[PDB]
Amino acid sequence: DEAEASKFVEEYDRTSQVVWNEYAGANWNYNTNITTETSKILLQKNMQIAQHTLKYGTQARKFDVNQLQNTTIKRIIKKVQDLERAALPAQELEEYNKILLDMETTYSVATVCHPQGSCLQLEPDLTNVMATSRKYEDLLWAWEGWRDKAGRAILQFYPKYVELINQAARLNGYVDAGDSWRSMYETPSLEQDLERLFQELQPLYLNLHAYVRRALHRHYGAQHINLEGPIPAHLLGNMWAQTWSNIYDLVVPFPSAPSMDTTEAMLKQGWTPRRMFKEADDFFTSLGLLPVPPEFWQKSMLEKPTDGREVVCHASAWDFYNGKDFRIKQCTTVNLEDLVVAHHEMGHIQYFMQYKDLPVALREGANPGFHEAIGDVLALSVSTPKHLHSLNLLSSGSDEHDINFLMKMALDKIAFIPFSYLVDQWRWRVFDGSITKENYNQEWWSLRLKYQGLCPPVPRTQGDFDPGAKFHIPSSVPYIRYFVSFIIQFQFHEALCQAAGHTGPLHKCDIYQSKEAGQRLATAMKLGFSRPWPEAMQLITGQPQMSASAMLSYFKPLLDWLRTENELHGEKLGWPQ
Numbered sequence: 001d002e003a004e005a006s007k008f009v010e011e012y013d014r015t016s017q018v019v020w021n022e023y024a025g026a027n028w029n030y031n032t033n034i035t036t037e038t039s040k041i042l043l044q045k046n047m048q049i050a051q052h053t054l055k056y057g058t059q060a061r062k063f064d065v066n067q068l069q070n071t072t073i074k075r076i077i078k079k080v081q082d083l084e085r086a087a088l089p090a091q092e093l094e095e096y097n098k099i100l101l102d103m104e105t106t107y108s109v110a111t112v113c114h115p116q117g118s119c120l121q122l123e124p125d126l127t128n129v130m131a132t133s134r135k136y137e138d139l140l141w142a143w144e145g146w147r148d149k150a151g152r153a154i155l156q157f158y159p160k161y162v163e164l165i166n167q168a169a170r171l172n173g174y175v176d177a178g179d180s181w182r183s184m185y186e187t188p189s190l191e192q193d194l195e196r197l198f199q200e201l202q203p204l205y206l207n208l209h210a211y212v213r214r215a216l217h218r219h220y221g222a223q224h225i226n227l228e229g230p231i232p233a234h235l236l237g238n239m240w241a242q243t244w245s246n247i248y249d250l251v252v253p254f255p256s257a258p259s260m261d262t263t264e265a266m267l268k269q270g271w272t273p274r275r276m277f278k279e280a281d282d283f284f285t286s287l288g289l290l291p292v293p294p295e296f297w298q299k300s301m302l303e304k305p306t307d308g309r310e311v312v313c314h315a316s317a318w319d320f321y322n323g324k325d326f327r328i329k330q331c332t333t334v335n336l337e338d339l340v341v342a343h344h345e346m347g348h349i350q351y352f353m354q355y356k357d358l359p360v361a362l363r364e365g366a367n368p369g370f371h372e373a374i375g376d377v378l379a380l381s382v383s384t385p386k387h388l389h390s391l392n393l394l395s396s397g398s399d400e401h402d403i404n405f406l407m408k409m410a411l412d413k414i415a416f417i418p419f420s421y422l423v424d425q426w427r428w429r430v431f432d433g434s435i436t437k438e439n440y441n442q443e444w445w446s447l448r449l450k451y452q453g454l455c456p457p458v459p460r461t462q463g464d465f466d467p468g469a470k471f472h473i474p475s476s477v478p479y480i481r482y483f484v485s486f487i488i489q490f491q492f493h494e495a496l497c498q499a500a501g502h503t504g505p506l507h508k509c510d511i512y513q514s515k516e517a518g519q520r521l522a523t524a525m526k527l528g529f530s531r532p533w534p535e536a537m538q539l540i541t542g543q544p545q546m547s548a549s550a551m552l553s554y555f556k557p558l559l560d561w562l563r564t565e566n567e568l569h570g571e572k573l574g575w576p577q
C-alpha cells in the first residue's frame with residue numbers, strides 16, 4: 001500500500017529529527033569539551049541512534065520497493081533500508097564504535113618531541129614547521145616524527161576496522177565498504193569517469209611538478225633533487241604534500257612583480273577568526289544566499305577555547321537536524337589558508353540551510369562532492385587580486401602579477417588533484433581485499449609515486465602506516481568527494497561567472513554581489529538528495545556531466561607559461577627515475 005509507506009516515511013521523519021538532534025548535541029558537547037562525562041553521554045547516545053536505525057531500517061526492508069509508485073517515497077525508503085553500522089551484531093557494533101573512537105583520539109592527541117625538549121602537536125606547531133622551514137633536516141624530523149607517532153599508532157586498529165566496516169557493508173547488501181562508499185554517487189561508471197577526469201589534468205600537473213622540482217633543485221641542492229625523478233615528500237610546505245602553496249616564495253614565476261603575503265597583512269591589520277566568518281557570511285548574502293542564524297554566532301566554536309576546555313581541532317560544519325541550529329567548529333588561526341577553510345565550512349552550512357525543509361533522508365548534497373564544492377566556489381572569487389585588494393590585503397595590472405596569481409592558485413588546486421585522487425584508490429583496494437596489512441604501506445607509496453610523483457625522504461619499514469598519518473583515514477571520512485569537488489568547483493565558477501555577465505579570462509572573474517550567480521546555486525542546493533546529481537549539475541551549468549574543461553580553461557595561461565618555461569630548461573616531464 002502507498003498509504004502505508006507514506007505513513008511510515010512520516011514517522012521515520014518525525015522520530016529521526018529528535019534522535020539525530022540528541023545525538024548531534026552529545027557529539028558536539030564531546031567535541032568542544034572532551035571529558036569523562038561528555039564521553040559517557042556520547043556512547044550512550046550512540047546506542048540510542050543505533051537502536052532507532054535498526055527499528056526503522058528493519059521496517060523499511062519489509063517494503064517491496066519494486067511495488068512502490070511515488071518516487072520520493074521509494075527513494076526515502078531505499079535509504080532507510082541501509083542500517084550502516086547498525087547492521088552489525090551487538091558485540092561487533094560496540095567494538096567498531098570503540099575502534100573508531102580510539103583511532104580519532106590517537107590521531108588527535110599524537111605529539112612529536114625533542115629529547116629533553118618541547119612536544120609539538122600537529123596544529124599549529126608541526127604544520128607551521130612544514131610551512132615555513134627551509135631546512136631539509138628540520139622538515140624531515142617533522143615529516144618522519146609525525147609518521148612515527150601518529151601513523152604507526154593507528155596500525156594496531158586498522159585491520160579490525162576494515163573487517164568491521166566491510167562486515168556492516170555486506171550486511172547492508174554491498175560487496176565491501178568501498179562499494180558502499182562509491183554507491184553514494186549513484187553513478188555506475190564512476191571509477192572510469194574519475195579516471196578520465198584525472199587523465200585530463202595530467203599536462204597541467206606534470207608541468208607544475210617539473211617546474212616545482214627545478215625550483216627545489218635550486219634551493220635544496222643538486223645532490224638532494226633528482227631532475228628526472230620523484231620529489232621528496234617533505235619539501236612541499238604541507239604535511240601530506242597535498243597542497244603546495246606554502247613554497248610559493250621558492251617558485252615565484254616573476255619575482256620582479258612582488259606581492260603582499262595575505263597572512264602577514266591579515267595579522268598586520270588585526271583580523272580575528274570572527275571577522276573571517278563575518279566576511280564569508282557577507283559573501284553568501286551578497287549573492288542573495290541565506291545568512292547564518294543569530295544562534296550560529298552564539299553557539300559555534302570559531303577558535304580554540306581559552307578556558308582550558310579540551311576540543312577536537314579539525315574544521316567541521318554541523319547540522320543538528322532541527323532546521324534552525326547549525327554550527328562550525330574550527331580552531332581558526334588567522335591566515336589565508338584558514339580564510340579559505342572558513343568559506344569551505346560556511347559552504348556546508350549554507351547547503352544545510354538550503355535543504356532544511358526536505359525530509360531528513362534527503363537532507364544531503366546532490367553527491368558528497370557537491371557538498372564539498374559550495375564554499376570553495378565562493379573562495380575562488382575571494383582569492384582574486386581584485387577581491388583581496390578590496391579587503392585591504394593586497395596593494396592592487398600586469399601579465400607578471402597575473403601568472404604569479406595563477407601559480408599561487410595552481411599550488412593549491414592542481415597539486416591537490418593527484419593527492420585527492422589516490423587516497424580512496426588505496427582504501428577501495430584495502431576494502432576489497434587486494435591490499436592486506438602485509439602491504440598497506442608499500443601500496444600507499446606505490447600510489448604516492450604513480451599519481452603524485454613523490455618519494456619518501458626516509459625508507460619506510462615494516463610497522464610504518466603512513467596512511468594513518470592523514471586525518472581522514474583514522475576518522476573514516478571518504479575522500480573521493482574532494483577530487484570531485486575540485487573538478488566541479490571550476491565548472492560551477494565558470495557557470496556562475498557567465499551567469500553574472502563576466503567576460504574575458506575566467507580567472508579574473510569575481511562573482512561578489514551577483515544575484516544571478518546566487519540563484520543558480522540556490523535552486524540546486526534546494527534539491528538536497530531528492531534527484532540524481534546530474535540534475536543539480538544541469539541547473540548550475542546548463543549541462544549534466546562532470547568535466548575538467550572549466551579547470552583547464554581557468555589555468556590555460558599558466559599551462560602555456562609552464563610549457564615555454566619547462567621547454568627552455570629541457571625539463572623531462574614525469575619521473576621515470
Ligand SMILES: *[C@@H]1O[C@H](CO[C@@H]2O[C@@H](C)[C@@H](O)[C@@H](O)[C@@H]2O)[C@@H](O[C@@H]2O[C@H](CO)[C@@H](O[C@@H]3O[C@H](CO[C@H]4O[C@H](CO)[C@@H](O)[C@H](O)[C@@H]4O[C@@H]4O[C@H](CO)[C@@H](O)[C@H](O)[C@H]4NC(C)=O)[C@@H](O)[C@H](O[C@H]4O[C@H](CO)[C@@H](O)[C@H](O)[C@@H]4O[C@@H]4O[C@H](CO)[C@@H](O)[C@H](O)[C@H]4NC(C)=O)[C@@H]3O)[C@H](O)[C@H]2NC(C)=O)[C@H](O)[C@H]1NC(C)=O
Pocket residue numbers: 006007009010013070071072073323356357358359360530
Ligand atoms: C510523491 O510524494 C512526494 C512526497 O510527499 C510528501 O511526503 C509524503 C510522505 C506525504 O507526507 C505527502 O503528503 C507529502 O507532501 C510529493 O512531494 C511533495 O509535493 C508537494 C506538492 O504536492 C510539495 O509541496 C511543496 O513543499 C514546500 C516545502 O515543504 C516544507 O516546507 C514548508 C515551509 O517551511 C512547509 O509549508 C511544508 O509543510 C514542508 O515542511 C517540512 O516537511 C518535512 C517533511 O516532509 C519536514 O522534514 C520539515 O522539517 C518541514 N519543515 C517545516 C517548516 O515544518 C512548500 O513550501 C511548497 O509551497 C508551494 O506549493 C504550493 C502547492 O504545490 C503552491 O501553490 C504554493 O503557491 C507554493 O509555491 C511557491 O510558494 C513560494 C513561497 O510562498 C513562492 O515564493 C513560489 O513562487 C511558489 N511557487 C509556485 C509558482 O508554486 C509546497 O507545498 C512537497 O515539497 C513535496 N515533498 C517533497 C519535499 O518532495 C510528490 O508530489 C508525490 N508525487 C506525485 C506524482 O504525486
Ligand SMILES: C[C@H](N[C@H](C(=O)O)[C@@H]1CCCN1C(=O)[C@@H](N)CC(=O)O)C(=O)N1CCC[C@H]1C(=O)O
Pocket residue numbers: 314315316317318341344345348371372477482
Ligand atoms: C577542513 C576539512 N574538514 C572536513 C570538511 O569540512 O569537509 C570535515 C572533516 C571531514 C568531515 N568534515 C565536515 O565538515 C562534515 N561534517 C561536513 C559535511 O560532510 O557535510 C577537510 O578535511 N578538507 C577540506 C578540503 C580537503 C580536505 C583535507 O583537508 O584534507
Ligand SMILES: *[C@@H]1O[C@H](CO)[C@@H](O)[C@H](O)[C@H]1NC(C)=O
Pocket residue numbers: 033035037038309
Ligand atoms: C565541560 O565539561 C564538564 C563535564 O561535563 C561540564 O560539567 C562543564 O560544564 C563543561 N564546561 C562548559 C563551559 O561547557
Ligand SMILES: [Cl-]
Pocket residue numbers: 240466467469
Ligand atoms: Cl605519507
Ligand SMILES: [Cl-]
Pocket residue numbers: 181184368369478479480481
Ligand atoms: Cl565521497
Ligand SMILES: [Zn+2]
Pocket residue numbers: 344348371372
Ligand atoms: Zn568539507
